[PDB]
């Protein structure tokens, strides 16, 4: 009952967080690259697909991918469509970091008040 239910709850809860963190880790990579190159970033369907098993150490076709915490988290977002863009993920529910709305498909690099920079900050705040 109570101790063991709690134990299972926490184990599951931890897997969820670990998955989400791993996703935000991939998203933070993309951003950091754009910042390093002084370039813009595309977070729409022209950016990377986050429902790629290879992003999480699984080969394509591996049947266990479908049973992964990553797939569990990603496929249950209201934005999931088989694919899932950065924007889809960030604006998708339910996840432990909530939702970002008013997201644009593209953030251009600009010398002053860098859009990509402002994107980086808000994602950074969510991935913490």
């Amino acid at each position: 009952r109570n101790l063991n239910a709690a134990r299972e709850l926490f184990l599951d809860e931890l897997k969820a967080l670990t998955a989400e963190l791993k996703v935000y880790s991939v998203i933070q990579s993309q951003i950091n690259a754009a910042l390093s190159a002084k370039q813009g970033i595309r977070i729409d369907a022209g950016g990377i697909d986050l429902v790629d098993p290879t992003l999480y150490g699984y080969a394509v076709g591996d049947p266990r991918w479908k049973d992964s915490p990553e797939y569990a988290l990603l496929s249950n977002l209201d934005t999931f469509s088989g694919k899932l863009s950065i924007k889809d993920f960030l604006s998708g529910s339910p996840k432990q970091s909530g939702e970002l709305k008013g997201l644009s498909d593209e953030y251009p690099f600009e010398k002053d008040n860098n859009p990509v920079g402002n994107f980086a900050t808000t994602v950074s705040d969510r991935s913490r």
Partner: antibody
Amino acid sequence: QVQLLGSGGGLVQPGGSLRLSCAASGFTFRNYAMIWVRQAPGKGLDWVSTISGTGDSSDYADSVRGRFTVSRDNSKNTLYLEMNSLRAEDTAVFYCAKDSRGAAAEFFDYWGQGIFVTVSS
Amino acid sequence: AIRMTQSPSSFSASIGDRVTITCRASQGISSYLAWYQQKPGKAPNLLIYATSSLQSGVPSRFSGSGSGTDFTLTITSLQSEDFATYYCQQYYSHPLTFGGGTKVEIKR
């Protein structure tokens, strides 16, 4: 100075339409997600809609879904709220507001002065 | 909607009083809470974001704290020009929701 000059308010018949307008200056508008907030007489603040910087994404409170449309003109630096099928309950002051940081709609450092909407026959 | 329950809905205090406004969320919202001041017949002004980051230009007598579900706005030394209505606002998720507001009045 940062400014958001609102207009397009006023008196309208029940069932009628209005187009609220908010002209932005003093910041690079196209880099800020924006919101509309309403405040009914003697009531608190209610979020109405959100629009992304480029205007390629928008969200709405369930009560205005379908009958309100948010839009923006980034060349002219204008924010719009088209309002149709208006009800007495829509009578309120409307504020446009810019996100502090811009990339998403979260918390809002600049708010336009309220636009009065009265719905009455 | 994440419901934000603000309390109290109003109070009177003397100048110099320390005053505390409470905001409770219907679910966890981590730190994604902000506070606004609204002087009568004016648009709101941002006081605090991220639970406790003070907005540039705001006096330090305003401070925010909380975690998850319970949030507080403190005015540590109330002044005559603090007469306003104060709202909390969550931004953990959409729709963005605001507290009912606390009207602060001033005894003299």
